[PDB]
């Protein structure tokens, strides 16, 4: 309903500025008579009225202010001279009135400009040429404020309707950006734009190398006992904001966080050469970063650590509650990894040890390798 | 001592450009991570630059293009080129590890002020 705010708000304003441009014209005359103080009376009260009887109902309204406004301008006029100015007024409402009322009664606004067009090629001719009531400089005075308030009007009302198109633009745009921002945050911009579209495709995208590491806390539920639950999920999201903070600044993508698990892929969205070394790199800054960190008893928190990597698949699944996902045999691997790792270590398979040897030092212990650092010499 | 020193830090005018100096003592370089960030007082201290040990590199968006992260790992030291520089850079840049980040242990940074 905001096109007819913008409507009601541009006609409330009008008609204000139009009593108070007539009420100086009122004050100013002296000597004028009494004849067309009973019609400007009857002008200014109707004028003044209307925007508080706007809720009536319907566009009469409206158009029942521009009747009024165009028999009181045809009356004045009639009886004083050409010269005075009525024939302005005329043309500044043609291109108002266009404005004051919405699209879809266009034709009908058309044909109201029309209307007005008619009395002004009348008004030279019918109307009897200056015509002399009382003093005549005073009409040249008003013809000066003639032109004055007609272009001053219509300067008003439409850099009002200016400002209250741009304002609504302003907040439309603000509300808008937010609720993108946060779509972009929650998944890739790629994928969102199918997710968009009204035609509905399965997502399924071929990846012929990816690693995944899987990340996980040990004697979860022996801390949950002693902890009341509210404590525990601000602990889980402090020590799942810090890892969110190492991931997006090493570049590597996380594709969701279940319970005490962490899950992090590498190079689905966009392949590389050296995934497993990035990999790698992340998970020995992780581990470091998690011994750091403190929990609220005070005992350090363990991850077990486990990596591997080969062919993936990825996309969406469902017809609700999307999120990216990925699949493949090597989360299988990097589970079982995960799941048989020591407290405090890293593990991977012989496949992976075949590509991490050359730049990182993989030592002791299908067969595994633990994974122990870079090493120092550069 | 695990210390960190900043300098560089000085007086310049919009679309300058800058080379901030980040040297660590107690550390080997080769083996860890390394980023900038920047106070301004409106936010606590964001990331503005990272470079890991591999040489892969990233910055924020704000910062894209502009600024570049360099290491010289014999002076055991990492360079933050700053280029095209605008007032939303006038902060306190500082510098760490991931390690050093989150227990909040750090130096004294080095100030940088964008103006005429």
């Known amino acids: 309903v905001a096109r007819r705010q913008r409507v009601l708000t541009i006609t409330a304003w009008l008609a204000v500025v139009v009593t108070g441009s007539f009420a100086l014209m009122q004050l100013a005359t002296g000597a004028g008579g009494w004849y067309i103080a009973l019609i400007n009376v009857f002008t200014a009260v109707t004028f003044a009225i209307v925007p508080l009887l706007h809720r009536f109902g319907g566009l009469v309204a409206p158009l029942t202010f521009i009747g009024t406004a165009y028999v009181a301008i045809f009356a004045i006029g009639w009886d004083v001279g050409t010269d005075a100015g009525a024939q302005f007024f005329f043309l500044v409402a043609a291109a108002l009135v266009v404005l004051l009322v919405g699209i879809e009664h266009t034709a009908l606004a058309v044909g109201l400009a029309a209307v007005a067009a008619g009395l002004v090629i009348a008004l030279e001719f019918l109307v009897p040429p200056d015509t002399g009531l009382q003093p005549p400089w005073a009409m040249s005075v008003s013809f000066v404020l003639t032109t004055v308030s007609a272009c001053g009007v219509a300067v008003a009302t439409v850099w009002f309707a200016l400002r209250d198109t741009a304002r609504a633009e302003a907040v439309m745009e603000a509300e808008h950006d937010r609720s993108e921002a946060l779509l972009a945050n929650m998944l890739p911009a790629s994928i969102a734009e199918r997710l968009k579209e009204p035609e509905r495709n399965i997502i399924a995208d071929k990846y012929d190398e990816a690693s995944v590491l899987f990340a996980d806390i040990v004697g979860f539920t022996e801390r949950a006992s002693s902890t009341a639950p509210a404590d525990l999920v601000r602990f889980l999201d402090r020590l799942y904001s810090a890892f969110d903070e190492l991931v997006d600044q090493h570049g590597l993508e996380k594709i969701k966080v279940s319970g005490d698990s962490y899950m992090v892929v590498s190079g689905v969205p966009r392949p590389r050469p050296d995934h497993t070394q990035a990999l790698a790199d992340f998970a020995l800054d992780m581990t470091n970063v998690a011994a750091q960190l403190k929990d609220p008893r005070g005992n350090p928190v363990p991850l077990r650590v486990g990596l591997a990597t080969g062919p993936v698949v990825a996309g969406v699944v469902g017809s609700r509650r999307f999120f990216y996902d990925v699949w493949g045999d090597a989360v299988n691997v990097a589970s079982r990894m995960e799941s048989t790792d020591s407290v405090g270590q890293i593990q991977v398979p012989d496949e992976v040890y075949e590509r991490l040897k050359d730049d990182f030092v993989l030592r002791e212990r299908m067969r595994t390798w633990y994974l122990i650092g870079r090493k120092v010499a550069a | 001592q695990w210390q960190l020193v900043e300098s560089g830090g000085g007086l310049v005018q919009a679309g300058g450009s800058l080379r901030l100096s980040c040297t660590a003592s107690?550390?080997?370089?080769?083996?860890?991570?390394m980023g900038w960030y920047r106070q301004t007082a409106g936010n606590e201290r964001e990331w503005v630059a990272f470079?890991?040990?591999?040489?892969?590199?990233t910055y924020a968006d704000s910062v894209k293009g502009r600024f570049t992260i360099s290491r010289d790992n014999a002076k055991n030291t990492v360079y933050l080129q700053m280029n095209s520089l605008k007032p939303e850079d006038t902060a306190v840049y500082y510098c760490?590890?991931?390690?050093?980040?989150?227990?909040?242990?750090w130096g004294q940074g080095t100030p940088v002020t964008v103006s005429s």
């Open positions: 760490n590890t991931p390690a050093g980040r989150v227990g909040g242990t």
């Open positions: 107690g550390i080997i370089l080769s083996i860890n991570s």
């Open positions: 470079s890991t040990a591999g040489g892969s590199t």
